[PDB]
Design a protein around this ligand. Structure first.
Ligand SMILES: CC(=O)N[C@@H]1[C@@H](O)[C@H](O[C@@H]2O[C@H](CO)[C@@H](O[C@@H]3O[C@H](CO)[C@@H](O[C@@H]4O[C@H](CO)[C@@H](O[C@@H]5O[C@H](CO)[C@@H](O)[C@H](O)[C@H]5NC(C)=O)[C@H](O)[C@H]4NC(C)=O)[C@H](O)[C@H]3NC(C)=O)[C@H](O)[C@H]2NC(C)=O)[C@@H](CO)O[C@H]1O
Length: 371
């Protein structure tokens, strides 16, 4: 059965006005799996709420899982880790049997108290960033998943992971067959392919080769097709591969506004959105409205990569719209993938300000998957 894995960045409740996105803004019938991001750990592996005022005191954990009262078939998971949590503590925790056991027991306790149906492990990433034990992380990550699976089978809980996409990244972190063996599915983060950290403009989630890229050694390029075909060939069965898609774009400052193709020189991060409020990225809800309200933007489609981009003076923006989302889900259908994972629900056009219905990206996913 095809699944739709909706990540919910819970900090979105602090956004103002039309950017505010609470648990009550979720449509629980547009997802099959809803993921509460994020919880974290300390250096001894103790699972902990990162925002206890919201998660615990104001009952956000329980409000989230209570969505099952509306859609009884919905699964609600909690996600541990993420970008801001780093890699060091997960490396330290994974390497010690005492710390693994403490992570298993304290995360299980939180999952059961607050009525979650499972755990999404988003360690970014084994043997990367500020990892402590380096290459040992790869095997110890799989040992952690095995001990988690052994504990979770006593309660019927789901165990899932979010992982880096392209081969150059994945080989640093995972033994693919061992990971796929223990999880219910693998959510491949097939986005952030390029971004403001690069010296040239590039697409956030290009499906295939992009304009300005060399067709020589195509398999080393950062795109969704390369990533998905890597993970399938490395040993992830299609029925455990969930393909990530972004509900946001990434923004660049052009070095020269007249050189505005993909793979043009860039000077760092571009505009920020009104609610996400970070230079270098913009929610789809924010940018479809920005495009709507300022006709000076030039929107083009990269017909090689199957994704749109837009420029105005010094701004250059890669993003995904209904057409590129359709292309992505059709691609996933065409390789019999298990489903779609989206980051993240709170930057869909949930108010429908952009003339394509409420939740146009999420509704597109549901519609193209259903067919
Ligand atoms: C091909 C290749 O390998 N390219 C890499 C590229 O991947 C690297 O970029 C990083 O990619 C990873 C995925 O592999 C990104 O991590 C994913 O994707 C989500 C969206 O990118 C990411 O969301 C971020 O989560 C942060 C928390 O961890 C959010 O911080 C929050 O900011 C809020 C204000 O906006 C604030 O209120 C919150 O308190 C704060 N949260 C916390 C707990 O502090 C951040 O806003 C959010 N970004 C969004 C929404 O756009 C997730 O963490 C993670 N998801 C999952 C499921 O794991 C990672 O974000 C990318 N890095 C950066 C810097 O963007 C790149 C590194 O430079 O290198 C390329 O080579």
């Amino acid at each position: 059965d095809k699944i739709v894995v909706c990540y919910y960045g819970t900090w979105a409740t602090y956004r103002t006005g039309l950017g505010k996105f609470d648990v009550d803004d979720i449509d629980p019938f547009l997802c099959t799996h809803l993921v509460y991001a994020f919880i974290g750990i300390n250096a001894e592996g103790t699972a902990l709420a990162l925002d206890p005022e919201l998660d615990v005191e104001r009952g956000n954990f329980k409000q989230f899982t209570s969505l099952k009262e509306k859609n009884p078939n919905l699964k609600t998971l909690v996600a541990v880790g993420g970008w801001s949590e780093g890699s060091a503590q997960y490396s330290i925790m994974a390497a010690e049997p005492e710390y693994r056991q403490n992570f298993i027991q304290t995360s299980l306790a939180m999952i059961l108290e607050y009525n979650f149906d499972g755990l999404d492990v988003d360690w970014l990433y084994p043997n990367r960033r500020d990892t402590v034990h380096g290459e040992d992380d790869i095997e110890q990550f799989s040992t952690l998943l095995k001990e988690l699976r052994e504990e979770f089978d006593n309660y019927g809980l789901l165990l899932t992971v979010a992982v880096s996409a392209v081969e150059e990244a994945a080989v640093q972190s995972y033994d693919v067959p061992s990971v796929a063996k223990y999880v219910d599915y693998i959510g491949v983060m097939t986005y952030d392919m390029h971004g403001a950290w690069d010296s040239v403009t590039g697409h956030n989630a290009p499906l295939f080769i992009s304009e300005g890229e060399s067709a020589e050694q195509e398999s080393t390029l950062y795109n969704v097709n390369n990533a998905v075909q890597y993970w399938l060939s490395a040993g992830c069965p299609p029925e455990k591969l969930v393909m990530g898609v972004p509900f946001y774009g990434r923004t660049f400052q052009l070095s020269d506004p007249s050189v505005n193709a993909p793979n043009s020189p860039s000077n760092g991060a571009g505009l920020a959105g009104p609610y996400t409020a970070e230079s270098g990225y913009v929610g789809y809800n924010e940018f479809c409205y920005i495009l709507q309200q300022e006709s000076s933007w030039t929107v083009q489609t990269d017909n090689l990569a199957k994704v749109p981009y837009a420029f105005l003076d010094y701004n250059w923006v890669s993003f995904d719209n209904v057409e590129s989302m359709t292309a992505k889900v059709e691609y996933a259908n065409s390789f019999n993938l298990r489903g779609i994972m989206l980051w993240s629900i709170e930057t869909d056009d949930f108010h429908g300000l952009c003339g394509e219905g409420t939740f146009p990206l999420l509704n597109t996913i549901n519609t193209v998957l259903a067919e």
